[model samples]
Target chain A: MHFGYWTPIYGGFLRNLGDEGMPATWDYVKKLSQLADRLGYHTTLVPELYLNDRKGVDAPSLEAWSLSSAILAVTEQLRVMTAVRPGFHLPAVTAKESATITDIAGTTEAGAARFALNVVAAWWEEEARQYGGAFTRHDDRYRQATEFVDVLRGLWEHTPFTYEGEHFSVRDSILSPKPGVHPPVFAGGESESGRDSIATFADSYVLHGGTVEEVRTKIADMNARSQRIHQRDMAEFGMSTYIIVRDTEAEARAELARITTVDPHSPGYASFEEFVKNSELDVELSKREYSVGTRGLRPDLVGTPEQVAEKIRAYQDAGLTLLLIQCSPAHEELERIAEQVFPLVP
Target chain B: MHFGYWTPIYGGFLRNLGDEGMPATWDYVKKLSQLADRLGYHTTLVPELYLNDRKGVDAPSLEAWSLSSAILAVTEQLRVMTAVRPGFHLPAVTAKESATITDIAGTTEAGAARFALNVVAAWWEEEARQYGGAFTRHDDRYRQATEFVDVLRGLWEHTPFTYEGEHFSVRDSILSPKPGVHPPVFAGGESESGRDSIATFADSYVLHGGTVEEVRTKIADMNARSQRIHQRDMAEFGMSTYIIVRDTEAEARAELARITTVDPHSPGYASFEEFVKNSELDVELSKREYSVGTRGLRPDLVGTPEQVAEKIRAYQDAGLTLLLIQCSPAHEELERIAEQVFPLVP
Candidate 1:
């Protein structure tokens, strides 16, 4: 399975621990990306959020496109899978910028085809109202996302592309210097429209951390959904998790206990409430899930190195090919995970 | 004195000549930024143009922010002043991304602060209507430009700053880990509202290339107006130019003749006609004005290195401290200007 890590752009993945925030600086993310590359990680999912959910909306956070461009320029052999929201950025414009990054972080120059878009049919209403256009309803958000994809692909793949959709309309606009390679899009959602939206266009599939059975089921469903909808198999599958690999399960468990001890009054709780309130997941989340970003702990990833590796193997066998994992104290643990678990995973 | 390049973003700066465009890739911009830094140039004005006037609008060009972010990350000394259109971007959202680059490219930590935003009250009506927002008339464009500056600075300099302007509204919206130092701004425009919008907010001012008297007159007026209106000197003044430095004035003149041979029916000519149509400058433009991008040759910058160097000295004497230069063929002549002209300047 291809391994990736969540960039600590929000200053750490877990909001529950004291002083757990990572430095959301270029210095820090640059180190994290280069380290992940050196450690043989395959992708780094840089999220797009106007607010710092791991810290607070008022706290400073890294901008995804800027971070993605810098990280992609600096690293080789790592996919800077930047997330784009329809509300946050206009679509053909996003496609144009994507080509910008792709050109600078060229296909072979970076030793891999480096750029991808994690097109999130956005969920944050406050962000939309403040930093973007008026938020459409959820169903329309998906429709906008689809139109966004149409505009993006047409711009990237053809000359003087145009589109007309209910949510977005365009004339003969153009995007030149197309991305180095066709960008792989990772789509995630669980709503009926969301599933259909993703199934209709996503190049790959990603889901928030779920049970092995849950992941297996979703992957299987998407595997068929693509054939039913697009007449092709899904290109790849990915899942997110928060892992704490230690020498012993008890040690890992103790560390997890310390990290997931939630403080409801933490700076992140305000943003957390919004995410949980709006989340349309298959299962209700636990408080632990709420504490960590990405609902990462939902996958039950805390364990000894061998135990975690075995779990990863199980997921791989169940058709998962990409694992996007995160942990707090980012730079330090990245080393441990690279040295220990990576050797055992495959 | 300071100097900058247009980043050969739309490939090469000139379109009428054969093979005039650069590769328009990350690799190229990275090389150009580093070279400028090493050559002791001051700033790179990365423009935001939705259409490529040199290649057709459908031709691919680097997006300014992506190019700016990557260039800023890799270079140690060059100031990456990225241009932004209020129509093309949401100001608060633009503010967040600006901070993200500042953190990574660094100010105190990178040993110098380098990121700056060039707020362009956009002019591309068709582009704004297509890739960005509803086309605001010229006056509101600057009104929105003022709010754009307001939102950017407020988000950078305050806590949960709020605004309710004609163009935008936000409340308690925040982007954290503010940039270490306040990023400087470069302002461009020729309209009355444009000048007022700039006078109130700009840290540096740039104008399209013009005759020496035109430049001196504008600079003097703006300098006096700034001190009179805002009680400070205009921080710096810059103008565009197209250099044709060669071993001798005859060789330079020969090259200039070749490059200035403009056809009225070229792809770029349509854009040029519109440029001339809307330009509100006092002095009548010559055929030389239509020969290059930004109407660069209007400044009469073409000559041997020594002759060009003398003209540069005259401008520097006029208090024009920066020159945003262009050439028909880039890379090689950039070195010529550097080696031949740089030593001759202060």
Candidate 2:
């Protein structure tokens, strides 16, 4: 299994934990990446948020594609995965730019893979409102996303394809400088409509974190559905989680508690509430919840390095191949997890 | 004055030496840039040629913007000036991408300036024919270019401007994450219509090579004309020349002779002739009817480093502030000029 960490792209992951040392600056991000590289991390997944999700709507955030390109240029051996919401980018143009990036990454001189796109159906209503991005109703958004992914795949496979779809039309469009190997498609959705879109088009199924039993059941369901639809079995599977790993379970739990304090009236609390309302999960989260920022903090992620590694192994044994982990006080906690937990895993 | 060279983005600049190591790959381009930086060359101007103009039209060439962004990411201080034709890109989209590049450059951690754009007025009829681009008549093209520049400048300076013009119209258009600095616009034009456009909109005038007297006359005329219209002088002016600098004038002349030999029937020679015919320059090009190429060679660029520097100083005295120099077999010759000629200039 490969290990990757989510870049706290907008300063830090926690709302109440004042300034986590990883401010939205290249200096801090580069330093964190160098530490991650030395400590055996294989990839870095950078989440795309136009507005600062952790701070407030007005807080600044670096644009994702540019930062990812810069990071890919700076680092060696670490796969840089950038999140892409289809509505924000034109499909034909995206195919061309992505193909160009693939060439840059796959070049023998660069000696790095360009990138992979983490396809997410648009979720942040406030982000869309501020940025003036195209937003639609839930099922309809997934339908548009399905068409977007299909168009991208077709552009990669065949040049000058005439794609006539509900949202897009291209007459004999061609994408040059195609990747030596096609970039992997990763998508995550827990809604019935979302899961159907993933089963139909995704190479990897990325899940919001769940218990070992829950993850295993979800993987089984996705695989069976893909088979029924004449699709290939998911070659890669990923889960998102925030890690708190240390030498012992007591020490890890103590650190977690120290960082989990939440301010009820902080602007991010409303965002947390919105995510909880949208997610398809068994657990309910309050507006001032102390859980990790992404919907990945289920019952299984809060533990010691050994305990976390063991649970990760359980998920891997159940056929998960990638871990998309997020952490608080990003620079400090990320390095600690890399140092203490990554070595403990295979 | 700032000194830079155009790396052979197309196949070879010279006709006879088909395999003179023009440095087409990204690896070699990076190495050449490092050498330039070490030798104190101010910048590198990478030309944008979709189809190989020097070789056959089907020969491969790297895409300009991608290469420029990657090079910017890798280099420490080298300023990359890349060519952009307005017909090929949308102003709003290009401005957004360029803004990202400028942010990366001006960022404290990266310590690199990403790019400047070389605005080339319509050339290469075949490129437009093959690529499905909208090619307009020469005077009409310049008018369109004026509108193009207006849109780009407004988008960079003011947020959400409603612009309506002959060629482009946008309702309350805004560019996000504006660049740290608006990149200086470098435009080259020789015709009366072309000169009028440059005087109206361009930040700098980049000229094709000519004798000392010819360049002096042209610069004087442009300054007077621009002063009359704007009630102020234009921004910096630049000149483009194919340089063959050496330790001695004898050696420089020999190198020039070897690099400029052309076969009249070769494919590149015919395309070169087409360029000369379309340009409609007032200067006499060739004494012999069999001589085939653009009018660049008639300007007499052969001389030692000191001698070439003397001519450059003459142009500077006449009001040129930037020197956009080109060298045949770019990698080696550019290194030699940067090492020997650059220090001698100032």
Candidate 3:
């Protein structure tokens, strides 16, 4: 599987206490990205969210698009994937932004894959309302996203593309300096319209963490839907995973216990609880699951390096091509996971 | 005087021409930005427009924000100023994006001057309508920009900024990973509402090129207005200029002769006429003014580097502290201006 890590756009991705050794600073983030590149990691996913989930709304967090551009500018081999919300940005403008990043981050002959996008049919209503973005009903979000993706592709592919959709209408919008390549688009959803939109538009499917059987079922379902509805095959499949790779299972489990051990009154807990309440998830999450981002550790990947590699193999064997992972105390854990698990997974 | 150049956002600055060894590509832009940083140029302004002014809408042009972020990420000393329109962007979101760039681009002893905002009251109605932006009349444009600047400043300074305006409304908005310093806001205008907005809101004023007497009259008017109405002094002042510095007066004039050469019916000439037709300018533009991107060239800086320096000093005497210059072939002229004109100016 193509291994990737969710970058510390929210400052190290732990949803428990504030300041988990990952300062919401670009210094640490730049180091993390270069370290990931040095350790042979394939991709780094930068999520888009304004408020800090760990440090509360009043605290600091990084903006995703600018940070992604910065990361891509610094690193050479790492594929930078930034998440974009339909409501948050203008699609035609976003298409050129993606191209600009890709232009700076030179291609390495693996099919012009310097930059990719993760389209999030946004769930944060408060964020949209506060920021003056286009927030609407649940299914309508998907409809807007369908138009959004089409506009991105249309502007990237055709010059002065004109579109008249029910949700988004454009008359001859243009995106210049288009990198000579259009990056891949990825999305995830549990609802029927979400799946339809993904099958119609997305180049890849992202799944929240789940069991081996659950991932197998999701892959099969997405593949069948793409073949039946769109007369095409689903692109790469990925799952969210949190890695805890230690020398021994005992040590890894102990570390996991500490990471997962949660207090309700922590600074980040309220934000975490707010997110969970606002979200519409396919699978329910426990407090511990909610503590880890991405719908609660869909991979269930916690063990020794060998064991973690074996679990990765199981998922990889089930036609999953990408693994988007998170690690508690990400700075050092990223290095440890790289040294221990990355080689074995490949 | 502070020196800045309009980045090659539309490949080359000259409109009636298509290719001038400057493709609307990032490779060339990166080279130009670093050259500016190394050559002691103080600032580089990145303009925002959807349509390509050099090659028409059918051709390519770089997006300003992404390009600016990448430019700041790569360079160390140069201040990257990105122009933003109230109609094109959500102000709060743009504030977060600016903070993100500032976070990556470290500040010097002079505070957070590495990143800056150039607020332009947009006049491109067709571009806005095509992209689904909030477009209106000229007075309303400045009205919206007034609220836009307020929202940006409020979000940067306050934790939970709640603002209500005719053009924009936001409740309990949050911007995280806030830069330790806030960048200065710069804008240009001559209209009553435009000058009023800049005098009240912007930290610095940018003006299209004008004659020596014209610039003095404008700056004095602005300072007097600010002193009388707001009971405060106007900050920095910048004038737009086009430079043609060479080893001798003959070569400089020859190059100027080579560059200003324009035709009536070029591919992108229609868009140029449309822009001039739509814009509400304080002074009627001449043929030379139409040749340059902004209005006319300030200080009439078109001679040898030593002679050019004299004109800059004359403008400096006239209370113009910044010179925003546009050279015909930016990729190479940037280096030439740095080697010749930069040292002589100071």
Candidate 4:
């Protein structure tokens, strides 16, 4: 499986922890991305959050597209799949930015596009309202996301690209300096409408961390839906998980225990509540699972290096090709995983 | 006077030149920006356009903010004043982008903000139509521009910034990781409504190339208008101009003659015509003036180093503290102007 990590854009990804020793600053992100590039990582996922969901709405968070450009310019090998909530972004502008960053990232030995998009139908209603973005019900949001993908795909695949969708329309628009290869569109949604939208448009399917059976079932379902809709298999299957790699299984479990103590007084607790209220998750989320958000702990990638590697191999055997990881104090843990876990897994 | 260059974003400033050796690619822009950083240029103007206005819609052009971020990340000292049209951009999103870029540009010895906004109440009707951007009458556009700046300044200056305006409204929008210092808002316009809106909102006033008297009159008028409105003088005044400095006046004139051979059939000719139709310029735009649009040649900086330096001195004496310059084959001409003319000026 290809190793990919969520960029610590929300300052180290642990919601309950007061300080993760990670500053959501470009300098830190630049250094960490360079290290990931030097290591054997294949991609970094830059999450888009106008408000600092990991901390609070008031704390600092780096904007995704600009940070994505900086990372592409600074790093050598890591593909950056930045999150794009269609409600928060204009399709044409987003399309143009994708192309520009692709150009920035494609100046490599192989000359391939290293930019991708993770399309998230809007779930942060408050952020959308504050930013004057288009917010809608879940079904309509999925409809908008589908149209959003249509516009992006139309712009990238053809010259004088035009689209007349209900959500967005462009007339004879031209996206010059198009990406050498069309940027892969990745989308994640668990709702029936969202799944249908993704099957119709997404190049890759992503999911929040789940158990092996859960992940295996999701992959099969999504693959079947995609094949039914487009007569082709999904391009990639990935899951977001928090990995805790240590020298001993007991040490890893102790670290996990240290982090999973979810506090209701924490600033992110309300955000977690808001997320569950807003999103359509297939499973009930426990407070410990909400500690990192995204149900990241359920994958249970917490063990000694050999144990973690064995679990990852099982995941790969289940047809999961990409692993989107999260860790605390990312600069060090990224190094730890790179040295201890990467070599054993793939 | 501080030297700034229009980032050869449209691949060199000259309308007639087919091959200026300035490719609209990130590699070239990164190299050129780094060189400019070393050569003592104070700022770069990144113009935003959905279509390649300088070389027709078919040509390649880089998007401004991503390029600006890459430029800021690659260079050490150069301030990037990227263009933002209120119609084409969301104020909160743009405000967030400005703050993020400012953060990117602020990791320095001085830790001062090196990002600014050049607000253009967009006038390209066709490009706006193609990109689904809002295009309105001149006065309404200026009104929207005012609200745009209000949103940006409010977000940067306060926590939970909120605004209600005819063009845009934001409710309790928080821009975290705000610039250590608010990025300055710079704007240029020749029409009455544009000038009034800019005087009320902009921190810096800019103008197209004009004679010393015209520039002096404009500076005085804007200063008076700003003082009347805000009870403070405008912070800085800048003008756009093209330079052709050589060892001899005759050599400079010959080079100018070669570049100014304007063709009616050039791809940029239609754009110039459209600009004239869309914008409300104070002066009549002759076709020769459109050869290097923005009337960049009107400053008549085409002479020996000593002569061009003297003209710049005259403009500086006219209270223009900044010069936004343009030249063909920007990499070579930038060095030439830096080496030959900058020292001869103030």
Candidate 5:
């Protein structure tokens, strides 16, 4: 089984406390990436954000694409999966740039292929409105996403393809110097339209946090659907959760309490609510829980390192090959998990 | 008297030799950037080439924009002036990305604003043709460049401005978080059309190497024309040159000889010819001379560090504030020049 963590490209996930002291700089991210690499982490997912979604509307946030490009340049072993929303970028140009990135990262080697893309059909209405990008309805967004992936996959695998779909049309288009290996596509969706798009095009299915049974059922459903569509089995599965692993359950619980006690009325809570609503998330999170960020705590993330590792093993048994974990105050918690928890898994 | 050097984005400048034992990876560039910061180099120009232009057309080369983005992330004090040819990029989207880069580099605080666009109007015909972009006639290309720069500058300085030029038209366009400082538009042209476009739109004039008298005359001509059009002088002027500075003239010349000895009958020679023809440069360069790269050497670049310093002072006297220098086998020569030449100047 492989493990990945969400990079705090938007800043630290804690909103209520002003003194989280997690540095939101390239220096910190570089250190974190190096630490993760040494500890055998498989990938880093950089979320796409314009404003700091976790730190309120007016707070500073790093742009995702530029940060991802730099992160891919620095780290060697980690799969740098950058989240991209189709509406915010032109697919043809983005495809060309991604190919350029693959060239720089030296990912063409048999075992060294390191780039992956997380395709997000953007859900933040305010972000879309402020940024002045096209935002469609839920079903229409998925339709566009399907066409977007179809074009990207075709351009990567075939030269000079003419794809005319419901949302996109390209005639005799070619993307040069395709990645040494086709970079895997990762997507998440619980709605019918979202699930259909993921099953049809995505290489990996990423989901918001769920119980092991829920995750297992989703994987089984996706696999069966893939077979019906005459496609090979999905290669990987990933789930997002907020983790609070520590040496003992008491230590973990205290840490969780410290993080979760931040006020819901703080600046980032409203934006978090908007994201949840726009994302059409199946599970509802309370304002306070949303302010704390990530739905992973529902399964009681407060635990010892071995206990956390056992939970991961359960997900692994459910055919979820990748765990996309989120941690508050990313740097300290991430280092602790990588050093103290990752080794306990095997 | 500010000095800058082109960071070798490719593995190294020598394509035929293969790898040249140079650190072409991202780790090396990041280290080099930190070294440059400590050495007090003012800026680093990252060249844009879809294919390896210095090496054979098929040789591996890193993409400039992504490399520049990475460099901007790592370096604290160096200005990264990235080259962007009009044919390869869309102006509207380029404007947005440039704004994003400026924010990442902390250019707004005047620490070192991250972007300066080298407006390239020529070369790599095959790249344009292969990529299926508009490869216009010589004068038309400059015309398009004028509109491109005009759009960029207008979008940067003003919001919701309508631009209706012959080649580009934007209606009610607004670019957000416009670069901290307007990225100075640097352009080079020896031909009448090239000079005219520079006079009309460019923020700074960049020229290939010329004799002191020639450069002075061209600078005067451009300054006069720009003053006539805008009723004010430009903010900066610069020149591009290849340098070989050592303790003695003989040592520098020997180094130059080692790099310039390319076989005239090789397949890459024809490609070199195309570069000369496409640039519309005033001075004619042979395959061997062009192989040394950077037109700066045409003004007799083989000289001692003191002599090179004197030549730079002459250009400064000619109303140029920036000196963009190129060194073949970039890492070694760049360090040497930074150590030996930067101290001798000013």
Candidate 6:
């Protein structure tokens, strides 16, 4: 199975700790990207954020599109999946940026572009309202997101593409020197409208971390939806989880316990509340999950190297092709996973 | 005096030529940027453009902000002044991007950031209409631009900034780890409303290429307006011009004559008309002037190295502190200027 990691654009994954040894600066990301490139990592997910939601609203957060472009320029093998919120970005301009980023990053050995995109129908009402982004009801955001993806695809595939949609309209727009290969689109959702929208447009389906049974069921469900929509299976299946591979099971569990001990007064608590209020989730969330986003703690990937490796093998058996990992003190932890755990896995 | 060059985002400065030996690709720009950085160039102006206005609408053009961020990552000494069209971008997002770019590029010897901005009140109605950008009457565009700059400054300077304006509104927004130094705002205008608005908001005044007398007069006018508005002189004056440096005056003039020959049916001709019709210019323009944009040919910087240096010195005497140059086959011409003309300028 391919292994990827979430770029710590919000500085670190843990919300309780003020210092996770990762600065929300360009140098740190650049160094980390180059290291991952050398260590045989598959991809890095650069989240698009206007504010530092993980640390605090007052803390620094790197803008993902710009940072992603720089990462592609510095790294050789890793593909960068930059998140895009359709409500906040103009699709035509986004298409232009995608092509330009591909140009900057160069092509892979098989003539495929190294850039990718993750579509997130936005859930931050305060950010949307403050930045003059489009915001509407739950289902309508999905509707607009579908139209947005359609426009991006149209611009990349056809010269002088035209589209008339409920949310976006374009006529005779052109994107010259389109990417060598169309960047793959990845989307995730647990709600009804979100699932339908993602299945209709995305090439791959992503998920928050879950149990082996939960992941297997979710993959089967998405495959059936793809069969209904296009009479074929999806391109890839990926999931997000936090990994803690220590020398012993006890050490790993101790580390997890430390991270999960959340502070009620931490600035991230308010943002967690906003996210819960704004999104339509299929499952209930709690303060522990809020400490690490995307339900990262739900997957039990914390143990000795061999134990974690066996768990990952189970995830592979569940039909998950990619695992997006998160960890604190990312620089050292990334090296540990690459050296200690990766070799133990099949 | 500070010397800068306009990046060849459209491949070349000449509109009439299909191939001027400069490719609109990332490798070409990256190599050129490194060369300029080592050659003592002060800055590079990355133009913000959705379409390839210099070549043709269907031709390739690099997006400015992403390309600028990558450029900063790869280079060390050269400052990047990225153009921002206020009507096309959200100020909060742009401010976030600016701060991130500074973080990636690091600070200078004096603890100054290497990022800057050139605010353009957008004038391409066709592009605006297609991309869902804000397009209004001439005066209104400038008014919106004024409010846009105000919003950018407010978010950068205040902890919880609030702005209420006709074009934009923000409430209790915070930008963390603000830049060590504010990115300087540069703007250009010749119309009455444009001048008034730019004088009120801009930190520097830029102009289209002109003769020494015209450049001198515009500088005086802008200085007076700035004094009237804020009781201070503008920080700097800049002008855009095309340079042709040859071994002799005859050779330089030959190169100029070759580039100025225009094809009436060239794809760039329509874009030329659009710009003329949309902008409020103080001088008449023709096909020859259209071959190079921003009246680049009007500067008469075409001669031997010594002769061109003398003309540039005259402009410096006329109160111009920066000269933004454009040239065909930018890689070779950049070297020629850096090696042959730069030493003679004082």
Q: What DockQ do you compute for every candidate structure?
A: 0.70, 0.19, 0.73, 0.81, 0.21, 0.75
Q: What TM-score is obtained for chain B in each of the predicted models? A: 0.93, 0.90, 0.94, 0.97, 0.91, 0.98
lDDT at position A39, candidate 2: 67
Winning candidate number (DockQ): 4
User: What C-alpha root-mean-square deviation, in Å, does candidate 1 show against the real structure?
Assistant: 2.1
Comparing to the true complex, what docking class would candidate 4 get? high
Question: Which should have the higher DockQ, number 4 or number 6?
Answer: 4
What ordering of candidates by DockQ runs from best to worst? 4, 6, 3, 1, 5, 2
TM-scores for every predicted model: 0.95, 0.80, 0.96, 0.98, 0.78, 0.98
Q: On residues B1-346, what C-alpha lDDT tens digit does candidate 1 reach at each position?
A: 6766777888777656646736776766677778878877777788888778776676657788888888887888778878887777787888888888887676533465688777775556667656855566677777888888888889888877899899877788766777788788788878765686689988878888877788888898888778877888888787877778888778877877777776565565546555555454455455556567667877787777778888988898777988888865566767777888888887
Report the C-alpha lDDT of model 2 over B115-232, residue by residue, as the tens digit: 7787885476655543435566778778877877887788678765557767655556545545676887777777786787788887767777677788778888888878877877
lDDT of 2 by residue, A141-181 (tens): 77777878877888778755567667655556545445566
Clashing pairs in 2: none
Name the DockQ score for candidate 1: 0.70
lDDT of 5 by residue, A26-59 (tens): 6667778877777778888888765567766655
Model 4 chain B TM at: 0.97
Give the TM-score of chain A in candidate 3.
0.94
TM-scores of chain A across the candidates, in order, are 0.95, 0.91, 0.94, 0.97, 0.94, 0.97
Q: How does the DockQ of candidate 4 come out?
A: 0.81
Interface C-alpha RMSD per candidate, 1 decimal: 1.6, 4.5, 1.6, 1.1, 4.8, 1.2
Q: If ranked by lDDT, best first, what sequence of candidates would result?
A: 6, 4, 3, 1, 5, 2
Error of 4 at B115 (Å): 0.4
Per-residue lDDT, model 2, residue A146, is: 80
> What number of clashing residue pairs does each candidate have, in the order they appear?
11, 0, 7, 0, 3, 0
- Candidate 1 — which residues are off by over 4 angstroms? A108-112, B108-112, B263-265, B278-287
